[PDB]
Amino acid sequence: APRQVLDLEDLVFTQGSHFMANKRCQLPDGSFRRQRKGYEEVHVPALKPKPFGSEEQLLPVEKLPKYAQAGFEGFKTLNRIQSKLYRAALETDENLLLCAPTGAGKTNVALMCMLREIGKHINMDGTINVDDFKIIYIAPMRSLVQEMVGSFGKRLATYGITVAELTGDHQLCKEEISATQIIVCTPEKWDIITRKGGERTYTQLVRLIILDEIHLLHDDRGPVLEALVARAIRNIEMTQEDVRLIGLSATLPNYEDVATFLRVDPAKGLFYFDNSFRPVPLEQTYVGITEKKAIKRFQIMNEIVYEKIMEHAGKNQVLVFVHSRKETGKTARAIRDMCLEKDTLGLFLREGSASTEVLRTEAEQCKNLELKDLLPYGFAIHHAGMTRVDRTLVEDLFADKHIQVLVSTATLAWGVNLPAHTVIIKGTQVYSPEKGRWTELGALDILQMLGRAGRPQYDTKGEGILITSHGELQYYLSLLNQQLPIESQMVSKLPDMLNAEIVLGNVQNAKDAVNWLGYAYLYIRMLRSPTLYGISHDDLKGDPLLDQRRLDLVHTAALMLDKNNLVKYDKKTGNFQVTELGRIASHYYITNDTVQTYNQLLKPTLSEIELFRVFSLSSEFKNITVREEEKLELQKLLERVPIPVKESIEEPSAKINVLLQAFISQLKLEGFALMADMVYVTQSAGRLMRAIFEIVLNRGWAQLTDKTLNLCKMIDKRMWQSMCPLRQFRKLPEEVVKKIEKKNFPFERLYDLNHNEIGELIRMPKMGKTIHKYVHLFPKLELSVHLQPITRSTLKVELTITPDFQWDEKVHGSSEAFWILVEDVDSEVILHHEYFLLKAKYAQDEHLITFFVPVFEPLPPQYFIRVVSDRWLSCETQLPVSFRHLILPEKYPP
Amino acid sequence: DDTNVYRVTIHKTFEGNLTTKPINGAIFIFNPRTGQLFLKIIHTSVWAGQKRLGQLAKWKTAEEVAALIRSLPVEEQPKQIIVTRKGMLDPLEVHLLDFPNIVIKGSELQLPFQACLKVEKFGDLILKATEPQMVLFNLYDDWLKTISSYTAFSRLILILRALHVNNDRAKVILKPDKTTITEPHHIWPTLTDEEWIKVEVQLKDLILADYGKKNNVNVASLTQSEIRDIIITSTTSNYETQTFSSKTEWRVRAISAANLHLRTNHIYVSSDDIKETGYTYILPKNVLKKFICISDLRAQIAGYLYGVSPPDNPQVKEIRCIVMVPQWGTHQTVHLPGQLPQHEYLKEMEPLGWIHTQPNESPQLSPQDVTTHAKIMADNPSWDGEKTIIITCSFTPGSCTLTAYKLTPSGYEWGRQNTDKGNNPKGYLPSHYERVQMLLSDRFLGFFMVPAQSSWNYNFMGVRHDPNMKYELQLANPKEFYHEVHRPSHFLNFALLQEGEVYSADREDLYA
Amino acid sequence: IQGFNISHTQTRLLSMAKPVYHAITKHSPKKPVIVFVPSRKQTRLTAIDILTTCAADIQRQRFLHCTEKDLIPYLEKLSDSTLKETLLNGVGYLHEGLSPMERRLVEQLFSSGAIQVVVASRSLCWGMNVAAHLVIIMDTQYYNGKIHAYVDYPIYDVLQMVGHANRPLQDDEGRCVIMCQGSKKDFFKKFLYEPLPVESHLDHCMHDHFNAEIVTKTIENKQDAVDYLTWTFLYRRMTQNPNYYNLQGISHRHLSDHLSELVEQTLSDLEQSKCISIEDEMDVAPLNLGMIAAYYYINYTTIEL
């Protein structure tokens, strides 16, 4: 029996780690499904109060050290399991994995337990810094990560830690981040810095957020969690540095694999608790509407809204957490009409006409956003799509018991943690950017919205109702209960993980890659659940030590990636040869299909119209389709676009190309999923242009690399190539930009004019200061070259480039990089490529670019040397290297 | 012309029966620009057994014509094709759906193709064909080396109308006696230009005498308009259709320029009678490939040549510099400014003439290009007439072909006297062009020039181009014609709302 | 030539541990290999990298051809706790503060095979009597703490590190890892097999040699100094690099006129600073700093200061 290599698309969960590991459900003892006319009544019994545990008391701040008490103020009482596990977390280096119900605030207890453990490892002249041992970070949401960073900053401000954002680049901000305090970072950004080589020194000393969301099955962050687990396994195997993690998660089984991955004992470290131990009593219900018709569903939604208004008709505050972006504007000004449709039932939630701080809401009427029409009405508006300061100002008013009916979006519950007395999730469907269509919401948003049912301080006992579909009732039962195991998606990202291990040196041969993949969480999931991956019991009994799992491991995926021209690795010899293209694909997180399509399609002789079609032909939009209604507007969009899209046919690739052209032209998009796909394409386009520039530098195409650098600069500037050059300075008004676009004025003749001459030329004296600021903020560098020929075949070029631009901290930043590409005489061949960067501290310093230039027997009279800025657009200079007057040395005798 | 598809022989002088016999059909497709005539033969065997001939035939015309048009390169496209009898167009369009950009239109006057089908060798070979086949021929014969396509088409149309009106009169006028030999390649009978002029005057007088004798009117009393015409639908004067598009029509030009790099690997050189007295033009292949890739399929591109002669070799002229001026190109010419390129780096070099592109393949110097060369030679006292030549790089179908013309002094005087810019202007002479020695150069590498503050491809912005405008030069590579820097108007055609960027303002990226 | 696409020096230093173990497993299993450190500041980092590379190998003490008991006087005489720990693990360390007896002990340990890590320079020719078997300088271009930036390695030091891959004592083959650019890997591989040219630096350092030549105190001109420069390496460098010395002629009279113009320019540059005179063209003219350097045997710049 030979080895059974299976397809990773069907056998593994591609795009994994957020969706419903459990697939089985069961009815309770005395529950009965009473199907009524249009409304199924959920028979939810009374909840069971948690009894007092044996020797389980709250730990006060008296038994804690006073040095460790700094930074932990405001938490004088902890939970029973929290105070039971905090001593073991902060007194020992052993990892802990406990299952706590949602709403206990386990993240704030785990942060204090990490801070006490970091303060316990300190000297007399040593602070509470975690530069000797530090846990790893994992974020279920970006807004949740931002809220956790804002909480950790306020926590560490009392301890004296410098709160600094890690938003600078690795090459740009390297010396400043060396002596910096605790900061937060994205998991994908950390994986990119590890694949590029920047996170290598940041390893084992990165004081960041803690991990969470251990119900990670099938939706959101499969390859990211797989790369995190692979990096942890490669660290524990090779470096052997002891670094534990403080894991806090919901009530879910199969935590033993995550405990064994974190080297936590199942006896003393693992703990599983039921859902009845929640500190906030929430009475959930599942009213599943069986109406398949949308015309009946449009009335069933209004009936469910009326039932939710009748359930909160007393002294309470309703919070509508909608997961759709259009629902934030659709729920606005509709609740008043729904209350008026029920013969004025459910309105007047205040103590009177002007009571309950109605004059404070009446005084805040003049607003820049759409709150001017909502706040005098009986509703409100709170979304990130409207504004940033307005959502915070609405949340500050809703937290002050001044707004009882507040309709908001999912970004309000995904942001700062603000619970409510009675929340209601309506619709259970959001837009999927990866799938390109409508799909169910993530488990992280449901877990965030499940903590806002009933207030611990302002309420006694709250309730909750979820009006969803009958098909999602299994996932809703598996999320509310502790029945979802752990299942990793490492086998899907196994070619990308093998490429990241071979690029970083974590896998020496195929045997080392197989031994690294045999200790992954995917092998534990295939062992603890052989029916999920398709492994028989006899085949698992024939290989007890997972030798067949190591034979069917990522080494076969490494051979498949070598068949896809990703990395030069032979299956017979086992030795691999890494290339610059595979390293760029590992640093840019490119799949094996997209890299093969870029190797087969993209040529050095490919034009911009071919490059646009190659970028639109990516495999990321394989599940997306084309809308028939947008095809009429797509013709008018391509009619005014400088890049012709008529070379393609009626296809979703042409739709993606038109969306990329509209995002380059900064135009509004009708489709929301199309806008999300265009945003993802604009995010990946920088890495795609960098990989194309690397492939052109490896091939030697000067014009193609210059076009790719110009496209990357235009994508970074968020404007088309035909746009005005003055758009790079954002301090200038848009009317001055329109006046500069109307009047034909060269930018090369604007440097000779002063601030007084510029105001009288373009007939704009008020914009003369902004024109001078844009002239001073524009990069301008003078370059001189000293060419001394040593040999006829090799010529030494000593180029001394001196930047003559005005450096500013708010304009030029900390560093300004300009890529200098020495081309041929005909500007066809790229002989060498070097990137020089002048910092703000290195102002007025002459940069010495030393590079040896090879020559041939047809010695040209003059060559071309070009230099282009990466971030700043319209910055180019040509340096003629005249070899017509030079004298070549004599040849050497043998 | 589809009128020759269905035809039959009518005979029966004696024994008054007035019968007929089936004959083989034919299809007449001719291009007045190149003088080529594509003829297709139709066997009679296909006529028997097919009912509704009228419908069948009319549909069989645009069928094979679509395959013949699709079997030719894009450079040979029919471009602005027209039919004979104002009727069929539908069929044409249908068959040529594959290429709908080709316009279809009728004809103002009927073309006498029956005279072309009535020729001795043409009628005998057409009637003796036992199988359908496609044959090609050139009606201009050797007249292309003397008179342009206007005079050749006028004389050919006069001989066609004269041969169609009267076969015996034109047959006796086309045979001086028995001294004019007839080549197998030369369609018309070999005859001096003066003999063709006298035969053309006799043919015009024969056609005018035939029309005047048929209408019973004096031909000597007719006016010029009546002689030209002899040689409610009153407000529907044609239909000027859509001109450009800058959306798909410019996209076809950009895609053809995108395939110009693939067509740059095949180049041709002009081989003609070398008088062994002029210099030998040596141009680099890199600058030629750059000019072939930077040109367009509709707009004519042009440039200025600068170079020097090698030491101890006065019979060779190596071109080592190409100068580009900001200008705009037309369909038959290029609106180039009269400003001469002057720089400090060109003070040690010398101008070697000019180098222009030609979208249409013609074996002669263009009259507008000859007038531009005469105006450049007259306005520049430093530039010599014999030292400057116009290297016309014609756009070959699926290839490239470079031609070299030299200016005769009588031809230069004829071009300076020529002021009209039409397709057949006054003062144009075929003796104004002269072949010179020209070949590629691989041992010497040339350089390309660039404007100082502007670009060289200014076709998309014609309003900023002026003949009296002054501009400087620099040593750099010019951009393409369809580049984003060369066409700011195509990128500025964007009508979108600014409130669209406010929607979906989520900045979640999680990548550094 | 090992092509490294990592621009960071620390990332290139850290990423070369596992390929070093792979090359030790493939090419030379039983032959010793040494690693040179660029400076004393990266010496501890290089020792930590060598320890992490020796701990990465499952087969422990696989490159040690000698017993561990011989390194006990080498570890007992060490004051730093890190150096003794590195010598006990089979790597060892070296610094600038080594005693000459400690240098002889380190040389004996390198000849026997106790210490496999010796931080040596690449410009080492004729300045100390300390024995050594093999010297392979890897990653010569490192960041300097004095300038707080990246410093470029010299081409002569890289050529010496490429040519120093030879161990005639014990090994039968030599290896040399030249850390350069990925595009310059083939250029460095071609430039190493090809013979390297030689250029004269007498045009840059021209003041000291002309001062020591004209410091003979004979006359008040520069004719003898020009005649001494004509027989020096200036006339050789005029025919070797004519574009560097601003020479536009290759014949006898053209190069003679170019040398006369260069001598006139040098005389104008010497008389502009009032350091020499020009009178009757008899012989060379002395100076203060030149006579001080000739008599007191001191530097010219220190005498001028």
- What are the backbone dihedrals phi and psi of residue B206, each rounded to the nearest 5 degrees, phi first? -75, -40
Residues 857-876 of A with CB under 8 A from B: 858, 860-862, 864
Q: What is the separation of C-alpha A882 from the centre of its chain, rounded to a whole number of angstroms?
A: 49
Q: Where are the alpha helices (DSSP H) in B311-437?
A: 367-379, 409-417
Name the DSSP class of A238. Answer: I
Rounded CA-CA distance A510/A554 in Å is 8
Rounded CA-CA distance A608/A689 in Å is 12
**Number of other CB atoms surrounding residue C230 within 10 Å:** 14
The answer to whether the CB atoms of A679 and B504 lie below 8 A apart is yes
A746 is in an annotated binding site: no
The CA distances from residue A841 to A807, A808, C227, in Å, are 9, 10, 49
What is the per-residue DSSP string for A335-404? Answer: HHHHHHHTTS-S---SSSSSTTTHHHHHH----SSTHHHHTTTT---B-TTT-SHHHHHHHHHHHTT--S
Which tokens go with C223? 């004719």
**Number of other CB atoms surrounding residue A347 within 10 Å:** 16
Name the DSSP class of A310. Answer: H
Rounded CA-CA distance A573/A551 in Å is 16
Distance from CA of C43 to the nearest CA of A (A): 17
Pairing of strands B400-405, B267-269: parallel
Chain A residue numbers touching C247 (CB-CB < 8 A): 887
Per residue, what are the HEC states of chain C?
A: CCCCCCCCHHHHHHCCHHHHHHHHHHCCCCCCCCECCCCCCCHHHHHHHHHHHHHHCCCCCCCCCCCHHHHHHHHHCCCCHHHHHHHHCCCCCCCCCCCHHHHHHHHHHHHHCCCCECCCCCCCCCCCCCCCCCCCCCCCCCEECCCCEECCCCHHHHHHHHHCCCCCCCCCCCCCCCCCCCCCHHHHHHHHHCCCCCCCCCCCCCHHHHHHHHCCCCCCECHHHHHHHHCCHHHHHHHHCCCCCCCCCCCHHHHHHHHHHHHHHHHHHHHHCCCCCCCCCCCECCCHHHHHHHHCCCCHHHHHC
Residues 26-55 of C with CB under 8 A from A: 52
Q: Does B453 touch chain A (CB under 8 A)?
A: yes
Q: Does B232 touch chain A (CB under 8 A)?
A: no
Cα of first residue to Cα of last residue in chain C, in angstroms, is 47
Residues 52-81 of C with CB under 8 A from A: 52, 56
Rounded CA-CA distance A794/A554 in Å is 46
- What are the backbone dihedrals phi and psi of residue A357, each rounded to the nearest 5 degrees, phi first? 60, 45
Rounded CA-CA distance B255/A606 in Å is 11
Q: Does B487 touch chain A (CB under 8 A)?
A: yes
A892, C195 Cβ separation under 8 angstroms: yes
A864, A839 Cβ separation under 8 angstroms: no
User: What is the Cβ-side half-sphere exposure of residue A168, based on CA atoms within 13 angstroms?
Assistant: 17
Which tokens go with C69? 């008991």
Calculate the dihedral angle through the C-alpha atoms of A196, A199, A203, A205, rounding to the nearest 10 degrees.
Answer: 170
Chain A residue numbers touching C241 (CB-CB < 8 A): 788-790, 889
A133, A246 Cβ separation under 8 angstroms: no
What is the per-residue DSSP string for B168-200? Answer: HHHHHHS--SS-----SS--SPP--HHHHHHHH
B404, B435 Cβ separation under 8 angstroms: yes
Q: Does A664 touch chain B (CB under 8 A)?
A: no
A127 is in an annotated binding site: no
Report the run of H or E that residue A693 belongs to, with start and end. Answer: helix A672-699
Residues 390-449 of B with CB under 8 A from A: 443-445, 447-448
A195, A589 Cβ separation under 8 angstroms: yes
Rounded CA-CA distance C50/C90 in Å is 10
B80: left (phi over 0), alpha (psi -120 to 50) or beta: left
The answer to whether the CB atoms of A668 and B485 lie below 8 A apart is no
Distance from CA of B247 to the nearest CA of A (A): 5
Query: A555, A545, A821: which is closest to A707 by C-alpha?
Result: A821
User: What is the Cβ-side half-sphere exposure of residue C13, based on CA atoms within 13 angstroms?
Assistant: 23
Chain B residue numbers touching A668 (CB-CB < 8 A): 496-497, 499-501, 503
Rounded CA-CA distance A347/A405 in Å is 9
A103 is in an annotated binding site: yes
A451 is in an annotated binding site: no
Report the run of H or E that residue B25 belongs to, with start and end. Answer: strand B25-30
Distance from CA of A144 to the nearest CA of B (A): 11
The CA distances from residue B495 to A662, B344, C231, in Å, are 11, 46, 78
A105 is in an annotated binding site: yes
Which tokens go with C292? 């001080």
The answer to whether the CB atoms of A187 and B495 lie below 8 A apart is no
Rounded CA-CA distance A400/A423 in Å is 17
Decide: residue B142, CB within 10 A, 0-12 exposed, 13-18 middle, 19+ buried: middle
**Are chains C and B in contact at 3+ CB pairs closer than 8 Å?**
no
Calculate the dihedral angle through the C-alpha atoms of B356, B362, B364, B369, rounding to the nearest 10 degrees.
Answer: -30
Sheet order of strands, B36-42 included: B25-30, B36-42, B134-138
Per residue, what are the HEC states of A876-890?
A: EEEEEEECCCCCCCC
Query: B60, B59, B57, B105: which is closest to B84 by C-alpha?
Result: B105
Report the run of H or E that residue A673 belongs to, with start and end. Answer: helix A672-699
The answer to whether the CB atoms of B510 and A860 lie below 8 A apart is no
- What are the backbone dihedrals phi and psi of residue A136, each rounded to the nearest 5 degrees, phi first? -95, 165
What is the per-residue DSSP string for A69-115? Answer: HTT-TT-----HHHHHHHHHHHH-S--EEEE--TTS-HHHHHHHHHH
Q: Where are the alpha helices (DSSP H) in A470-563?
A: 473-480, 494-504, 510-518, 521-528, 530-533, 537-542, 547-551, 554-563
Beta bridge partners of C1: none
Quick one: angle between helices C252-272 and C233-240, nearest 10? Answer: 120
Quick one: angle between helices A580-587 and A187-196, nearest 10? Answer: 160
Beta bridge partners of B29: B38
Identify each DSSP E strand in B324-398 by its residue range.
Answer: 328-329, 334-335, 350-358, 389-394
Quick one: angle between helices A494-504 and A580-587, nearest 10? Answer: 120
Name the DSSP class of B382. Answer: S
Total residue length of chain B? 512
The CA distances from residue A677 to A192, A653, B229, in Å, are 21, 11, 65
Which tokens go with B260? 């110009």
Chain B residue numbers touching A880 (CB-CB < 8 A): 475
**Number of other CB atoms surrounding residue B233 within 10 Å:** 5
Closest-CA residue of A relative to B441 is A858
Q: Which residues of B53-86 are buried (b: 16+ CB within 10 A; e: fewer)?
A: eeeebbebbbebbbeebeeeeebbbbbebebbee
Beta bridge partners of A34: A41
Distance from CA of A176 to the nearest CA of B (A): 16
Which tokens go with C142? 């490192």
Q: Which residues of A360-377 are buried (b: 16+ CB within 10 A; e: fewer)?
A: ebeebeebebbbeebbee
Q: Does A745 touch chain B (CB under 8 A)?
A: no
Closest by Cβ to C195, choosing from A833, A852, A892 = A892
Rounded CA-CA distance A570/A173 in Å is 39
User: What Rg do the C-alpha atoms of chain A give, in angstroms?
Assistant: 31
Pairing of strands A246-249, A429-431: unpaired
A377, A405 Cβ separation under 8 angstroms: no
What is the per-residue DSSP string for A217-237? Answer: -SSS-HHHHHHHHHHHHHIII
Chain A residue numbers touching C184 (CB-CB < 8 A): 832, 852
Q: Does C260 touch chain A (CB under 8 A)?
A: no
Question: Given the structure tokens 């030689």, which residue do they identify?
Answer: C198
Distance from CA of A642 to the nearest CA of C (A): 36
Going C233 to C236 to C240 to C243, the CA torsion angle's sign is: positive
- What are the backbone dihedrals phi and psi of residue B138, each rounded to the nearest 5 degrees, phi first? -115, 120
Closest by Cβ to A238, choosing from C15, C56, C182 = C56
Q: Does B501 touch chain A (CB under 8 A)?
A: yes
Q: Where are the alpha helices (DSSP H) in B182-313?
A: 193-215, 224-230, 249-258, 285-294
